Symmetry: D2
Subunit: 392 residues, 4 copies
């Protein structure tokens, strides 16, 4: 009747063309799943279902979730499906696992998300039946399937900047949040607050010692307000959104081991956390950046809780302006938001981020002596999802 | 509270480059969803979730389930996700909807699947970071993401012929099943047995009046054993699988409206069917054609039923050899299998087929005065899914 | 000290994607060369040099002239080079052969041109070193290398329409010339005036009798002023140039056998024609359509002849407006211009047209009892070439 | 009236993806032409014709010779054509200019060649009319149009290794020649023997000051027999040709200013060289590496000279084995061959090399107090061209 989280692991997040560029999305998923199973002390052969999110499926091959499962050493006999809720994919994987466990149909599920935006292909839409004559387009699949609205063709970053302008969020407020996101991510790394959650990625090397990637690539200790203030708007000349106050494109994987509260008791397992509730809302595509505060308010109404009952928040930083506006919409103390840093500093590997923020939330709550947390994420197409957890 | 099915609708299935070539997958999904809502007498704004399957997501744009929902006239405020379980996607959308309704989290869900194999793009894996020198491959995304194993690169048709050979299923038995599949589909079309389930597709033209597609394109009244016996093996020169005794590539959409049994009773609705139970199994990728008989045997074990308790079966005809072998494994009377024809005749629009066979099963049971049916489908990667329904 | 033409042959001209679509440019060249050698009664092994024009060389393979030579049965021991003077390529092949013969370095040369605009590839300019991110272009090589200015990117048809507007050539005058070009080409075919020059193309057929293409595909007996007047401008909304009063894209080959006047006497050969003189001029790229009248005036000044000394003209119909304006610039009786039709009706297979108009000129002069002719052609990049011949 | 050479200039040769990667072929041609005009003290507006070679024309835009002419500051009013004789293109441009000047038709021509193998595109042969289904090839245009036989598809390097084997030229002899080619090119650069012929390329930067490229990139002072002997065969596992004893792919331009002997005397010019004679031969495509010795023997027969009458030779080093074998066939003293290095060290920018070896021969003769030289080059498709010059 309730689902517990036994474990939660994430790869470091790599920059576009960076540290993880030679690692497939399914291999990043595999690494995070394998670490999650080891930390849970759960046998790969006892997993009943693998539910995994990824957005840019084109060119990843049949059922990417199954490739991630096999790369983790989960046997062929374990069922799986791949889910796509754009930026929310990795979080909806976890909330679907919760719903299936709650039916009693399964009691042990691996859920999470992966993305290698470095490795997305280019596509040709007219090569099958023929262009016949005239120049046409060769299409960046990250842009076509992940970063632009299927209805308007408008970049997600244009919508982020339109919402910041309508919310009255200044360029300077966005840059101050970007600075604090970097400084919190850098401090979290240096002070050992990401050592527990991260599973390093080992990349075999011809020349000698393998490359071990153990640190988030994108956070910068030398970030300053003065440097951020010099950047030009990146999606729209009239706007306040820059390369500095919004995440770029990234690579990463994250995974959680979920079990029914009953089975966990029977096996003498101490859960990392309990899933208390989740909810999702949907709006027009252009309003997607507004959804995290709305999803939190809906989840508080559903659970009969208020904002003061929550110890920590993770709101995925799709734009600095989203963190800022969600604060005002939900009445959140910013000191309780994204306390180890967020996507502006860390990156937004879109199919992974929903799972990545839950991994981060669990460890941040544990670091602060446990309590109630909410993870909330907006997604392309106009959705918002939120999950409430208790860390003991 | 069990889940009931209020309505079930499908487009006609088109041939590759055929009658539905100018229609997007998401538009075929929209047409099926809108027909299912009208037949259920359900307002589009009362839908609480859309769960939709599609396999070749590359180039379809952000979250294709959302595109299909909007094309049906479902408002922005309705949540959605896109699921990928290769050939089983459209059936897993339905069984996930059943699981979510059984939690009480939602009471009214649209589920189904879509595919436009005619409109899948070509991809370039090296165009992003450069080929540097030497010739390389321009890749058919139906082949890369749908029709070849992610682990070996082997075509699904090679695995179908390998299993047919190991099962001792002759070329002649496969051609006989292919012939009966065509005769049954042609007879169903001619005798009015697909009129109820089909929603015609209207295609506006660059010239005069719109073209109305109201019939499955692939079944052939002129099918003969003589022609089938002359065809060459298509996937492997030593093998028994041909273009005639296996489906080719296809386009189509299918959708069902699901409601809690309690909400249906509350609104005074007469359900079209009840979902009794479902299960899934998984094996090594190369064994995928063996799964439908095993999924059926597992589902009977789970429900404490025997093969004699089931009135009709729909086993997706991934190969004629899968229908034949599944019959032996589950002990099925072939007169109760695919009685209005199956994929060898009708086609295999991969992300839609799992929903399409449920739509067909429901109507085939209604045509015999109701009863208990099982729909079972194998999928790329080595999975098998089965659902048991009751039609009143 | 003078060059004679022993023979002159051309394939029919095919429409884009039409009758010759399955024939490579080098095979069209081969067919025209082989016919020219047969009609000259010259052994393939006695040819000393092959000079062949083609504009869209990309994807044709190493030295296309050598492929055409070998397809004609000319042995490996015969030297060759491929020339590119855009639309003038096939004519400059012949005038270069004249210059080489005049040195005494060679005495027997095959010259002409070929083009298969049906078979030109598409290209990717960034796939080698990588697009990195963002959408880019897949490029029609006919557009990039043949039909647009290398300096401005402007289509040749935009320049044609700007020159017609500045010369004061009406839409109605252009349509009247297009009508007369069609009616003259249709009459030439029906009345046997193209039977001598054409070598049919034989395309082998699985099903039975081969396809023999023996007729120019594009001329239309049902062309009318009323039909032409309804077309919309095709390169530029403000312009008078349409799909009807300018050639499209085409396929074809043409070839001439050239010999020194001395060797022809020694071998007892009756030349078809003598090359008297040639010249070329160059202007800015946008003024290319002006050049044919200027080239004719320069060739008359060079030879001490006047317009009344010339019996027949061939001016390649790059636009109907070019034929009309060249008439006024050179003082030409239109009754002596393009008398068997021209490119508006027949097509413009760009690397062949310069050779094709010389083939046509020779046979038209022969039909009218011999005399002096000039062939003149404008070319992309701003050039004009003219050659004066005598048919005995 | 013979033809004289007033000036001869080349860019440095760049490595594939190296120092000249950001410079178009036509810009390298322009730089060489402008330097040749300045060194000849010839006004750009007095040039009467530009004959320029380039092999990978695909994607370079209309008539690349015209682009190179305009980039040099030659006015629109100067006629031009682009020539393709594969590897011999830049040399055939020069010998065609000689032939045209010998007619008296023109008295002042710029000739030469260019190639940017770094910037050649990739092509799609089926994108126009459609792939329909199945994977296909994205094609490197350097491979398709420059480096493979149009008839067999076999790499030029397979033919070079086949001829080396049949000629009995050991792996060790080829590596010894490779070593001497590097030592000679390095010594020529260090001792000032390329300062006169090179025109540096200035490349404006997206950052600070322009980069000046003034040295050939490919020669290596660190070349050893030890390293050469460890390399694996590159084109064929049984063969003796490696990445070390054959040139790779390269970028460069070269240009010469040619004038009638009579006009040079009239203007009181001191010619840099006189063209005495040239000839060409042709063989089967697979025999192309055998041609330079045969072209030399034919040119000696034509001029009534013997090998003892020639002071220096430039034989383009298509393979080290071609230099060695050509030496045996013509009876050349190797101390008189490629004395400032050759293509194994310097690179093989295919459409420029034939002009580049003439530029180098002229300067190498001037450095030894003048005399008679022969430049000889083999080319893809089975040709060999040789020109004899006298430097005063």
């Amino acid at each position: 009747s309730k689902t517990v989280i036994l474990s939660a692991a994430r790869t470091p997040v790599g920059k576009f063309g960076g540290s993880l560029k030679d690692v497939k999305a399914t291999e990043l998923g595999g690494i995070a799943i394998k670490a999650a199973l080891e930390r849970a002390n759960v046998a790969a052969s006892d997993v009943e279902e693998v539910i995994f999110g990824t957005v840019i499926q084109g060119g990843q091959g049949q059922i990417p979730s199954r490739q991630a499962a096999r790369a983790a050493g989960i046997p062929w006999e374990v069922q799986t499906e791949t889910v796509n809720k754009v930026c929310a994919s990795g979080l909806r994987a976890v909330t679907l696992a919760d719903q299936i466990i709650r039916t009693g149909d399964q009691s042990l599920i691996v859920a999470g998300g992966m993305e290698s935006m470095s490795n997305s292909p280019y596509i040709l839409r007219g090569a099958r039946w023929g262009y016949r004559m005239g120049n046409n387009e060769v299409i960046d699949l990250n842009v076509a399937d992940g970063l632009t609205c299927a209805f308007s063709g408008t970049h997600m970053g244009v919508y982020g900047g339109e919402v910041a302008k309508e919310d009255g969020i200044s360029r300077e407020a966005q840059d101050e949040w970007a600075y604090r996101s970097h400084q919190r991510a850098v401090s979290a790394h240096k002070e050992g607050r990401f050592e527990e959650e991260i599973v390093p990625v080992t990349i075999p090397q011809r020349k000698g010692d393998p490359i071990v990637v153990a640190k988030d690539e994108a956070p910068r200790e030398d970030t300053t307000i003065e440097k951020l203030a010099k950047l030009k708007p990146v999606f729209d000349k009239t706007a306040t959104v820059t390369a500095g106050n919004a995440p770029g494109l990234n690579d990463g994987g994250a995974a959680l081991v979920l079990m029914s509260e009953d089975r966990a008791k029977q096996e003498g397992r101490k859960p990392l956390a309990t899933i208390l509730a989740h909810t999702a809302i949907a709006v027009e595509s252009k309003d997607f950046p507004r959804t995290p505060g709305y999803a939190i308010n809906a989840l508080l109404e559903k659970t009969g809780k208020t904002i003061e009952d929550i110890d920590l928040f993770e709101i995925n930083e799709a734009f600095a302006a989203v963190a800022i506006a969600s604060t005002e919409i939900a009445g959140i103390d910013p000191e309780k938001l994204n306390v180890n840093g967020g996507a502006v500093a860390m990156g937004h590997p879109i199919g992974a981020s929903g799972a990545r923020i839950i991994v981060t939330l669990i460890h941040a709550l544990k670091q602060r002596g446990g309590g109630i947390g909410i993870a909330s994420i907006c997604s392309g197409g106009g959705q918002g999802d939120a999950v409430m957890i208790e860390v003991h």
